[PDB]
């Protein structure tokens, strides 16, 4: 299974994932590819933010789904 | 029956701007080759080759066609019936695709001029304009066809409009817009101005109606100001001879004071046809007062000032000769920028006209109840022990759920936030401990409950001082939907099935979050913010027709002010409450609501007057959400000026963009009764004066009369025997009378008896004479009786009457006598 | 032991006439024989028979009376007395029997022709009998059957007089006539100790030692009353003992012991070597003598106390000596007074004496009770149906019943004044329709105050009020039956008003009596009661027990037993706690009201303080009122059956002596009246309560907002330049600062916004209508801010500092907190 | 019917009366024979004071009964 996480800067990140993958380790694989630390990652699927600990199949993210990634950090 | 526009605009469309660029580059910017006024002109040192019929003129005619279609659509929505073309359509039915083609044609309508010769070579000039249009299409066939022009048949239709071989200026929407756009630009400073304005007003009026036509020509003057063209005044009482514009002629009044008509209708008279003794040209003021003119023109009796309001004549003229005039006539992007700004302002100026003006952009000062609300907030935070499952119990007062919903509804919680301090922020940790196990519920019913204080301790909070707490709290709101969905719904009073603690936390965190945002935000206030929402199909169509009704009844005007109707419809259809009462999340990047979150509803929120005071949320790095928070002031409305169909969301549902303008007015101020917070605060501070209550009960105590009576018995039995000399004498003569008088003074309550028996009590030196054990026992008892008499003598004769006199002076509000009563106590 | 009927030597007519006939026909006539025929003269009056004459004869009769009296007492005390053949005892002598005894005693010695006692006893007793029979026959008509059942009865007493065979122990008649004759022989013959022991020993078996001591103690008082010398007694006297029977002596051998077979010796018989006669001191100290005679170790003085021998001897020679020997009525009067005194002297002996005859001074609770009475009288508005409510305090039926039972209401009444008496009518008008109920249930209820106004009160000054009140008490039975029953705590089904009225009227009535009574106090008063059979029987028993344990004594003082029995049996409370009605005329209780119980109240020491009631014309009730002092006991000395009342009930007269002693004082727990009085003195302190209620008003921030909005409207819009600068600079900041100050209850802010208020002259710069109106608005807001700054910042802290000094008893510091107040 | 009222001064006063006769009735009669005015008179029968208004029949008084009369005055 492969999915795409699209960003605001314009990059399209392609990831090989399994349906049982967690959101933590989708963020971990996003980090290995583009070097964005997972603590700054907010991943959205069909308008819903994805939560660490739940799986890709929990959100019904299937083959060739597109996720959305925005940087979100505390101020200061 | 009016289809939603798609946001097509002369000022953002690229094809239209490209055609104007090519028109300038290849014709409008090149010198005239003919005779009549071919010589260039300078404005601030910059050459203009075609002063009248050049770039600026051509761009204005396209801008006219835009507003004419705009106002035609508004007029249809208001229920007006517009003039129809043969196919049954009116100008209100013009599509975006059709308006683009019309504008492209307009861009070339004058490119064929060899000079400013008017009558002599109409057809040569119009054929050369046509050929220029054909040349441009041919050179851009690949881009132009079929996307803009469907085929060569389509191109020839618009080429035929430019050529204008038969003067069929009412044949189609393209004919009317091209012809009227060209004509609207002829309203200028030629005299008499009243004749020109009435004429071109009458040409346009049948197609779009009087209200629309007033809007078009009012906007024209603004387009003239934006492009540095002179604007004439209008004087309905001008006695200069009227000008029949169609023919540049005159009407005549005969030997009797009658207009010469025909077998009626007014005789056209050539200007060179000099006439009879005592015959007269009809004046402007007579023409405008004709019944036929008053029924088709609302200018009678009215006056318009020329030039620019606020500029003296000497300054209007140095403005007209500024270098910006040459920039308008040679720079397509600058001139479109000038026109776009004027066009946008004509959508705001009518809105402000319909309401009481306001001068101050800042939030108002705190009111009595917000001050009390802040203090109650501070004291809850200081002592979280007061928080119960059902209520808050503080200083004897019980605050239930409705009290906190009332604060959410009636106080400006940003103002309340401005009254909180850094230790209230610091107490958030204490509050979260006390609420460690309080479970919050997302409005998303599939989401699981989240323990507020534990999640704050273990996930949200990151240590540090006050500023870091502020950023953490802002992060909680930006990041955790289980929390901000519940908070937002409660704050806007649209929640269902909330717990008391969810309401209370909403009422505490809303001002605390506002303070955190105000204390930390440093970004300059942006003037275009975007807000995404996911609305039901039924709710959005209510908003669409609410916004279209407001827009359709907001029009510029020349002589007829319809502000009253704009006020009525804006109050009937206002949906500012959708963005009110909470820390509303916005972004400067429309792609955050549109793409990331897939909203079907986007509010484009414009704040040109700086009334929203938005505050930066989080980080603004590339790839962030570029988030800002607004807490809407109580007197600011977000008034729609535009609705655009924007395509489909990811899930296939239509997406619409509502463009809202923030407008401040006392007419938007809500009416709330006072005391909702001051009431409970005052009860909390009523003093329990237990020190005075104890004073009262010390005046309660009873004297020990039995003890005085019994001591009399002992003195007598102590006396019956001589022992120490001559303490028996002393007992009978000094001690026994004093005890007899004391008892009689205390049996009654004779302060006067009690006062002077005090002086009769023997001195300690008198007792020094007797050293027996029973004599020393006696003085100790005697000192006790003296203390009992003295306490009653001072309380009943000094202290209590002084307090009573003081209070009677306070009861007559003579405060000087009140303090007198205490300070002026006389000794016994 | 049956109840005596009041028969007395000093009041029976038959016995006295028998004494006259004996005197007139024998005793008063000269002796016809040789021995002691010559008369002796006492103060100018002649006595023909100085030794065996009238005074001796009447004394023997008086001895027989007290011997029966003391024997009845001894029997009631449980003693065993000597029995006769038929099992009877001297205690069994009936009044009719004793009247026959004494009549025979009147003639026992009349048959004497001279003072010879050595012979012709037979002849002289024969003449005595002849004299007695001659009297009986002459007055046959009266004597029979009333005194003697028949002539056979007459011969028995004639036989006792004749004394043929000396059967001295045969019957009560023989014993009493013999012992009465022998008791008179105790005189001053020396040694006196030997004579007294012999005659004491002769009487002792018949009546017992306690009784025999009372007889011979009384005998000395009878000797004093009849002007006979009285000998002393010395237990260690050194004279030789005298064996009275046979005029012999007893002997101590050369050997150590007294000689016996104990052996009689003639005074003539000569004694062996250095043997000796037993001395009287050794006689008395012998065990057998001590066992029957309590004279050992005891000394009695001769003569009369407080008289020295030359005054005593002139007394013995007084003419009253011959009056006793020649005047039956005078000699009986001397004996009666002595007999009466011996019933009182043992009572006073058994209790702590007092020299104060007046009531004691008030205690604290009587003083407080009197104050409460005066305030109720002053404010009858306070009287409700259940309770009294006065000065925030509720006084119920129990409180007023406590006053009646614990206070001396006469002492309370002495603390009331003429204003309280004058207020009797205003109390009565307040009680116009209050119904009183007589203890007699068939009587119809009477409205108190209405009756008072239309039947009792006669106007006038306060003295007339007092007599009207005294009249209501004496005249209206519906009133005094309820009042007395409540006062003595023996009432049934009384209303609260009846209790309260009783509590108020008892001291007020005593004051009325005390101020009005003029006559000096009578010393005999009579009180009537209607007692149930069972209750009267209880009082008889208690009185008889007291009388039986009250005895004169010679050597053995039994005062401690009289004290113990009087406390166990005292019924003084029957006459206590209320204004008790008495009369100087016994027929008011006996005949008019028909009481079955009569208290003859003797007050010889003036301790009862009786007060005259009403008028005392002839035919009136001669009424006097007694409120018994707390330390006076009415001790019984006699109980007589007096016949039957008109309804056929038995009537008894109790004779009671008023005795005052600290031993009779009750002990009450104090406080029952002072406590409530202290509650009423409590101050309302209403002004201070209003200081705090006003110190708790929410500030009116409505008006401060009103002027803020008024300033704002004039501070957006003002074409005048200087007015808007002044409104935005000087007025609006003070109002915003005052609002937060009122809101925050901050003193620091309030005390200083006061200085920021613009002056009247700064306001006077603008002569606009609205500016003047605002100026008046600002002043009101300014006064509101100052009053709070002064209250919470100046006055309230000073009270707290004042109060805290008072809980440390730093009095001058508490004043100082008010005096020294700091400015802001 | 006839009754006699006895006094403390010794005299025995006979009155011709009839049961329906009140007490005032009786005093009045004693005042004419003895002229002792009514308001000084207190009448006692079997130890009970007899009150104005109520009749001779009410107090059981009957043929040849004995009543007792005392003078009762206010002091002063």
Q: What distances in angstroms separate CA D15 from CA C42, C816, D2, D6, D64, one per listed residue?
A: 61, 88, 6, 11, 10
- Got the DSSP string for C703-727? HHHHHHHHHHHHHHS-SSHHHHHHI
Last residue of one domain, picked from the residues B520, B552, B586:
B520
| Residue the block writes with tokens 């006077």 | C764
Total beta-carbon pairs less than 8 A apart between chain A and chain B: 71
**Domain shared by B593 and B628, yes or no:** yes
Asked if C706 contacts C739 with a C-beta cutoff of 8 angstroms, the reply is no
**Domain shared by C203 and C301, yes or no:** yes
Supply φ then ψ for residue B179, to 5 degrees.
-70, -50
Domain annotation covers residue B631? yes
Domain annotation covers residue B113? yes
Q: Give B653's contacts in chain A (Cβ within 8 Å).
A: none
Domain annotation covers residue C295? yes
Q: Give B621's contacts in chain A (Cβ within 8 Å).
A: 71, 73
Label residue B703 exposed, middle or buried (CB < 10 Å: 0-12, 13-18, 19+): buried
> Per this entry, what is the length of chain C?
824
Q: Give A4's contacts in chain B (Cβ within 8 Å).
A: none
**Domain shared by C531 and C450, yes or no:** no
A2-7 and A66-71 beta bridge pairing: parallel
- Got the DSSP string for C341-388? HTTTHHHHHTS---S--SPPPPPHHHHHHHHHHHHHHH-GGGB-SS-E
Supply φ then ψ for residue B54, to 5 degrees.
-115, -145
**Domain shared by B204 and B246, yes or no:** no
Q: Kindly determine whether residue B794 and residue C783, on different chains, have CB atoms separated by under 8 Å.
A: no
The number of distinct structural domains making up chain C is 4
**Domain shared by B402 and B536, yes or no:** no
**Domain shared by C61 and C131, yes or no:** yes
Which is nearest to B549 in space by CA: B79, B147, B57, B126? B79
Give the best residue of B519, B592, B597 to mutate against chain A (max A CB count within 10 A).
B597
* Tokens representing residue B527 in the block: 């003037």
Asked if the bond preceding C146 is cis, omega within 30° of 0, the reply is no
Which residue in C468, C591, C595 is closest to D74 by CB distance? Answer: C468
Residues of the domain holding A32: 1-76
* Tokens representing residue C443 in the block: 């009587």
Give the best residue of C592, C595, C621, C649 to mutate against chain D (max D CB count within 10 A).
C592
The count of other CB atoms within 10 Å of the CB of residue B214 is 24
Give the integer Cα–Cα distance in Å for B309 and C248.
Answer: 173
Q: Kindly determine whether residue D76 and residue C595, on different chains, have CB atoms separated by under 8 Å.
A: no
Q: Give B598's contacts in chain A (Cβ within 8 Å).
A: 46-47
* Tokens representing residue C369 in the block: 């009770």
Residues 6 or more apart from B522 whose CB is under 8 A from it? Answer: B616
Domain annotation covers residue B680? no
**Domain shared by B423 and B512, yes or no:** yes
Asked if C490 contacts C399 with a C-beta cutoff of 8 angstroms, the reply is no
Residues 6 or more apart from C677 whose CB is under 8 A from it? Answer: C368, C371, C372
Q: Give B692's contacts in chain C (Cβ within 8 Å).
A: 688, 691-692, 695, 796, 799-800, 803
Q: Kindly determine whether residue B619 and residue A49, on different chains, have CB atoms separated by under 8 Å.
A: no
Asked if the bond preceding B249 is cis, omega within 30° of 0, the reply is no
Partners of chain A (3+ Cβ pairs below 8 A): B
Alpha-helix residue ranges (DSSP H) falling in D1-76 = 23-33
**Domain shared by C486 and C580, yes or no:** no
**Domain shared by C79 and C140, yes or no:** yes
Give the integer Cα–Cα distance in Å for D5 and B561.
Answer: 125
* Tokens representing residue D72 in the block: 């009762």
Residues 6 or more apart from B234 whose CB is under 8 A from it? Answer: B193, B194, B197, B299, B302, B303, B304
* Angstroms from C817 CA to nearest CA on chain B: 9
Alpha-helix residue ranges (DSSP H) falling in A1-76 = 23-34
Supply φ then ψ for residue B494, to 5 degrees.
-125, 10
Partners of chain B (3+ Cβ pairs below 8 A): A, C
Label residue C412 exposed, middle or buried (CB < 10 Å: 0-12, 13-18, 19+): buried
Give the integer Cα–Cα distance in Å for C121 and C204.
Answer: 26
Last residue of one domain, picked from the residues C267, C299, C325:
C325
Helix axes C769-790, B815-823, angle to 10 degrees: 20
Give the integer Cα–Cα distance in Å for B450 and B456.
Answer: 10
- In terms of CA atoms, which chain B residue is nearest residue C671? B706
Residues 6 or more apart from C648 whose CB is under 8 A from it? Answer: none
Which is nearest to C754 in space by CA: C728, C727, C778? C778
- State yes or no: chains D and A have 3 or more CB pairs below 8 A: no
Q: Give B685's contacts in chain C (Cβ within 8 Å).
A: 745
- In terms of CA atoms, which chain A residue is nearest residue B444? A48
Asked if C445 contacts C493 with a C-beta cutoff of 8 angstroms, the reply is no
| Residues facing B439 on adjacent strands | B451
Asked if C588 contacts D47 with a C-beta cutoff of 8 angstroms, the reply is no
- State yes or no: chains A and C have 3 or more CB pairs below 8 A: no
Asked if B10 contacts B223 with a C-beta cutoff of 8 angstroms, the reply is no
Asked if B137 contacts B130 with a C-beta cutoff of 8 angstroms, the reply is no
Residues 6 or more apart from B87 whose CB is under 8 A from it? Answer: none
Domain annotation covers residue C353? no
**Domain shared by B87 and B199, yes or no:** yes
Domain annotation covers residue C246? no
The number of distinct structural domains making up chain D is 1
Which is nearest to B61 in space by CA: B220, B181, B141, B196? B181
Domain annotation covers residue C638? yes
Rg, Å, chain B Cα set: 45
Phi-psi region of C166 (alpha: psi -120 to 50; beta: other; left: phi over 0): left
Last residue of one domain, picked from the residues C603, C634, C667:
C667
C524-529 and C435-436 beta bridge pairing: unpaired
Give the integer Cα–Cα distance in Å for B409 and B503.
Answer: 12
**Domain shared by B788 and B798, yes or no:** yes
Q: Tell me the structure's resolution in angstroms, rounded to a single decimal.
A: 2.5
Asked if C552 contacts C219 with a C-beta cutoff of 8 angstroms, the reply is no
| Secondary structure letter of residue B251 according to DSSP | -
Residues of the domain holding C178: 13-241+279-325
Give the integer Cα–Cα distance in Å for B397 and C85.
Answer: 105
* Angstroms from A22 CA to nearest CA on chain B: 18
Give the integer Cα–Cα distance in Å for B277 and B646.
Answer: 69
Domain annotation covers residue B553? yes
**Domain shared by B24 and B163, yes or no:** yes
Give the best residue of B619, B651, B652, B655 to mutate against chain A (max A CB count within 10 A).
B619
């Amino acid at each position: 299974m492969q999915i795409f996480v699209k960003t605001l800067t314009g990059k399209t990140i392609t990831l090989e994932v399994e349906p049982s993958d967690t959101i933590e380790n989708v963020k971990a694989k996003i980090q290995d590819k583009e070097g964005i630390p997972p603590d700054q990652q907010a991943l959205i699927f069909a308008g819903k933010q994805l939560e660490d600990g739940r799986t890709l199949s929990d959100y019904n993210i299937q083959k060739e789904s597109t996720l959305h990634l925005v940087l979100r950090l505390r101020g200061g | 029956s009016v289809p939603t526009w798609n946001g097509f605009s002369l000022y953002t469309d690229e094809t239209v701007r490209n055609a104007a660029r090519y028109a300038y580059d290849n014709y409008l910017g090149k010198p005239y080759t003919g005779t009549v006024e071919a010589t260039p002109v300078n404005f601030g040192g910059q050459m203009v080759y075609r002063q009248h019929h050049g770039l600026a003129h051509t761009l204005r005619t396209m801008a006219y066609a835009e507003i004419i279609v705009e106002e035609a659509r508004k007029a249809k929505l208001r229920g007006e019936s517009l003039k129809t073309f043969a196919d049954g359509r009116t100008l209100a039915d013009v599509t975006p695709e059709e308006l683009r083609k019309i504008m492209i044609a307009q861009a070339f309508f004058v490119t064929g001029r060899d000079d400013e010769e008017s009558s002599k070579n109409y057809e040569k000039y119009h054929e050369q304009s046509r050929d220029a249009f054909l040349k441009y299409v041919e050179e851009n066939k690949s881009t132009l066809i079929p996307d803009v022009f469907k085929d060569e048949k389509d191109v020839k239709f618009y080429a035929d409009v430019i050529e204008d071989k038969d003067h069929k200026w009412a044949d189609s929407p393209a004919h009317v817009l091209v012809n009227q756009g060209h004509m609207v630009d002829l309203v200028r400073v030629k005299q008499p101005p009243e004749s020109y304005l009435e004429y071109y007003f009458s040409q346009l009026q049948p197609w779009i109606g009087s209200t629309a036509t007033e809007a078009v020509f009012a906007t024209q003057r603004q387009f003239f100001h934006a492009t540095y063209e002179a604007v004439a005044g209008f004087d309905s009482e001008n006695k200069e001879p009227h000008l029949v514009v169609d023919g540049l002629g005159r009407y005549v009044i005969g030997q009797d004071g009658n207009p010469i008509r025909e077998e009626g209708e007014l005789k056209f008279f050539s200007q060179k046809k000099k006439l009879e003794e005592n015959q007269r040209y009809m004046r402007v003021d007579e023409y405008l007062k004709l019944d036929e003119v008053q029924k088709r023109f609302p200018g009678a009796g009215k006056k318009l000032d020329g030039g620019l309001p606020g500029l003296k004549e000497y300054q209007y003229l140095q403005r007209l000769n500024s270098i910006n005039r040459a920039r308008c006539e040679n720079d397509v992007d600058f001139c479109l920028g000038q026109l776009q700004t004027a066009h946008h302002q004509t959508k705001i100026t009518p809105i402000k006209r319909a309401f009481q003006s306001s001068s101050e952009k800042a939030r108002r000062q705190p009111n009595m109840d917000e001050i009390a609300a802040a203090r109650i907030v501070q004291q809850i935070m200081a002592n979280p022990d007061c928080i119960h499952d059902d209520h808050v119990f503080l200083n004897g007062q019980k605050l239930e759920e409705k009290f906190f919903r009332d604060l959410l509804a009636k106080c400006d919680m940003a103002i309340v936030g401005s009254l909180l301090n850094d230790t209230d922020i610091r107490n958030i940790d204490t509050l979260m401990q006390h609420e460690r196990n309080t479970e919050f519920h997302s409005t998303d019913a599939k989401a699981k409950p989240v323990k507020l204080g534990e999640t704050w301790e273990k996930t949200i909070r990151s240590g540090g001082g006050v500023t870091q707490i502020k950023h953490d709290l802002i992060f909680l709101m930006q990041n955790d939907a289980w929390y901000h969905t519940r908070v937002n719904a409660i704050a806007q009073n649209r929640d269902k099935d909330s717990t008391f603690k969810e309401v209370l936390i909403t009422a505490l965190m809303t001002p605390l979050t506002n303070k955190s945002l105000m204390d930390t935000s440093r970004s300059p206030a942006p003037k275009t913010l975007f807000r995404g929402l996911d609305l039901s199909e039924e709710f959005k169509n209510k908003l669409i027709n609410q916004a279209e009704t407001i827009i359709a009844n907001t029009t510029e005007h020349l002589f007829t002010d319809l502000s009253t109707e704009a006020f009525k419809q804006i109050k009937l259809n206002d949906f500012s409450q959708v963005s009110a009462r909470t820390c509303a999340s916005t972004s400067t990047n429309i792609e955050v609501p549109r793409t990331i979150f897939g909203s079907n509803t986007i509010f484009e929120i414009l704040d040109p007057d700086g009334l929203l005071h938005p505050k930066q949320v989080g980080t603004h790095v590339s790839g962030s959400e570029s988030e800002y928070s607004i807490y809407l002031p109580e007197d600011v409305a977000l008034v729609p000026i535009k609705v655009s169909f924007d395509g489909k969301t990811g899930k296939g549902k239509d997406r619409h963009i509502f463009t809202l303008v923030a407008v401040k007015s006392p007419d938007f101020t809500p009416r709330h009764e006072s005391g909702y917070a001051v009431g409970p605060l005052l009860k909390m501070q009523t003093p329990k004066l237990e020190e005075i209550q104890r004073l009262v009960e010390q005046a309660r105590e009873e004297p020990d009369l039995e003890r005085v009576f019994n001591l009399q018995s002992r003195v007598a039995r102590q006396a019956k025997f001589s022992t120490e000399s001559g303490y028996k004498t002393f007992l009978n003569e000094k001690v026994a009378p004093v005890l007899e008088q004391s008892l009689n003074g205390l049996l009654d309550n004779n302060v006067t008896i009690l006062g002077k028996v005090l002086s009769a009590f023997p001195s300690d030196g008198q007792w020094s004479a007797f050293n027996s054990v029973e004599a020393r026992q006696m003085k100790i008892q005697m000192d006790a009786i003296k203390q009992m008499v003295e306490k009653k003598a001072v309380l009943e004769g000094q202290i209590l009457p002084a307090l009573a006199q003081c209070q009677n002076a306070l009861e007559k509000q003579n405060i000087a006598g009140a303090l007198q009563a205490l300070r002026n106590i006389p000794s016994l």
